[PDB]
Amino acid sequence: TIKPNNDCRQVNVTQLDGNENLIRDFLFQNFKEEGTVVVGGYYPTEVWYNCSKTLTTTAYAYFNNIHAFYFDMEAMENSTGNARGKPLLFHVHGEPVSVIIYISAYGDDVQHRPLLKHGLVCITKTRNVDYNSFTSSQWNSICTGNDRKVPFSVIPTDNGTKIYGLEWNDELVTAYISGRSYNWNINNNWFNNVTLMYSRSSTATWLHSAAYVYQGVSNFTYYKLNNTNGLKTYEFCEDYEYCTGYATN
Ligand SMILES: *[C@@H]1O[C@H](CO[C@@H]2O[C@@H](C)[C@@H](O)[C@@H](O)[C@@H]2O)[C@@H](O[C@@H]2O[C@H](CO)[C@@H](O)[C@H](O)[C@H]2NC(C)=O)[C@H](O)[C@H]1NC(C)=O
Ligand SMILES: *[C@@H]1O[C@H](CO)[C@@H](O[C@@H]2O[C@H](CO)[C@@H](O)[C@H](O)[C@H]2NC(C)=O)[C@H](O)[C@H]1NC(C)=O
Ligand SMILES: *[C@@H]1O[C@H](CO)[C@@H](O[C@@H]2O[C@H](CO)[C@@H](O)[C@H](O)[C@H]2NC(C)=O)[C@H](O)[C@H]1NC(C)=O
Ligand SMILES: *[C@@H]1O[C@H](CO)[C@@H](O[C@@H]2O[C@H](CO)[C@@H](O)[C@H](O)[C@H]2NC(C)=O)[C@H](O)[C@H]1NC(C)=O
Ligand SMILES: *[C@@H]1O[C@H](CO)[C@@H](O)[C@H](O)[C@H]1NC(C)=O
Ligand SMILES: *[C@@H]1O[C@H](CO)[C@@H](O)[C@H](O)[C@H]1NC(C)=O
Ligand SMILES: *[C@@H]1O[C@H](CO)[C@@H](O)[C@H](O)[C@H]1NC(C)=O
């Protein structure tokens, strides 16, 4: 879904440290009973992207025509206490309202940042956003003015074993964090693309590293979920005309 670039590579997300059950626990969020069902939606696939760059130059990645965006992180150091995070910024476009999601770095050292709340949501109406000023200034002056600022705490205790994500339609926005989903009723004209900043220089809130893998989802996917005697398994469905009736009946 990305515009082609030389700094982005493909990885198998489940074949990583701590991601043994990253996607299974996401698919089994709603089907908590025993038996077999079929679930359909903009669910993540096996192959994700890991964009990185050796040099310390601000880089970008562009995702075109996507209806969902998911990412996963590594385990934060000293997760039981003063956890030190890793940075990541991405912007979901739209009119008249767009959303900037920023995960700052470091721990209980960033000035005027609430303790153990590494995540920031900036709901904005401004058209052109300067990312250098956003990721190079102090936290108190990052998202100010007439924009809406919502700090939030990513979970350091999960050790990066939970998937983070976002999905948007013309009438609802769903945010998946920890093992929960939160809804937002808003009428905005989404452009269905995301601009991701994955590499920059070290600054007041940014730390040069690569600890995230991301994926944009554009297609509808159907999974067969089978829960037998506590053993939970999922499989891809190929027959589209058969799984649309299996998920509805
Ligand atoms: C790992 O973090 C712990 C806990 O951090 C403390 O509690 C957090 C919730 C937050 O308020 C932090 O700012 C706190 O520091 C650290 O334990 C502290 O260690 C210092 C060492 O000088 C000690 O003075 C404090 O009393 C300790 N606090 C507690 C609550 O026990 C610990 O040092 C960190 N480990 C490493 C290796 O950095
Ligand atoms: C995301 O998609 C939007 C779709 O609106 C793109 O913005 C439009 O780009 C076209 C290019 O021909 C312009 O004609 C429109 O005026 C733009 N609309 C705006 C700016 O509201 C946007 O460029 C895309 N962003 C990407 C690919 O990063
Ligand atoms: C994405 O791929 C990059 C490749 O650059 C990985 O970077 C490696 O990170 C480790 C741990 O810090 C370093 O020791 C290696 O030297 C890096 N590899 C290089 C520079 O080629 C990065 O870990 C990957 N991101 C993940 C798996 O989340
Ligand atoms: C869900 O998984 C279970 C295994 O836990 C499958 O159970 C099999 O059922 C067949 C048909 O009765 C038996 O012959 C096999 O011995 C069972 N397998 C095991 C390992 O016990 C069950 O079929 C699966 N459901 C679907 C729809 O594939
Ligand atoms: C994922 O694993 C499969 C099976 O081994 C392999 O063919 C594929 O290349 C892997 N994808 C990667 C390494 O991006
Ligand atoms: C995360 O790891 C820590 C030790 O590093 C452990 O105490 C904690 O239970 C782990 N959390 C999960 C969800 O596995
Ligand atoms: C997504 O669906 C399109 C048709 O809309 C198809 O051509 C394409 O192969 C699909 N991509 C993936 C990754 O499944």
Residue numbers in the entry: 18 to 266
Published text:
FCoV-23 is a recently emerged, highly pathogenic recombinant coronavirus responsible for a widespread outbreak of feline infectious peritonitis. All coronaviruses are decorated with several copies of a homotrimeric spike (S) glycoprotein that is the target of neutralizing antibodies, drives viral entry through receptor binding and membrane fusion and contributes to pathogenesis. FCoV-23 S-long comprises an amino-terminal S1 subunit, folding as five domains designated 0 and A–D, and a C-terminal S2 subunit. Collectively, these findings identify APN as a bona fide entry receptor for FCoV-23, which seems to have broad receptor species tropism, mirroring that of CCoV-HuPn-2018.
To reveal the 3D organization of the infection machinery of FCoV-23, we determined cryogenic electron microscopy (cryo-EM) structures of a prefusion-stabilized S glycoprotein ectodomain trimer construct comprising D0, which we designated ‘S-long’. 3D classification of the cryo-EM data revealed the presence of two distinct S protein conformations: one with a population of trimers with three D0 regions swung out, and the other with a population of trimers with two D0 regions swung out and one D0 region in a proximal conformation. The structure with mixed D0 conformations (b) is rendered from a composite model of the global S and local D0 refinements. Furthermore, the alphacoronavirus-specific S glycoprotein domain 0 (D0) mediates attachment to host cell-surface carbohydrates, which may facilitate the entry process. Most alphacoronavirus S glycoproteins have a D0, not present in other coronavirus genera, that most probably arose through the duplication of domain A (the latter domain is often referred to as the N-terminal domain for betacoronaviruses).
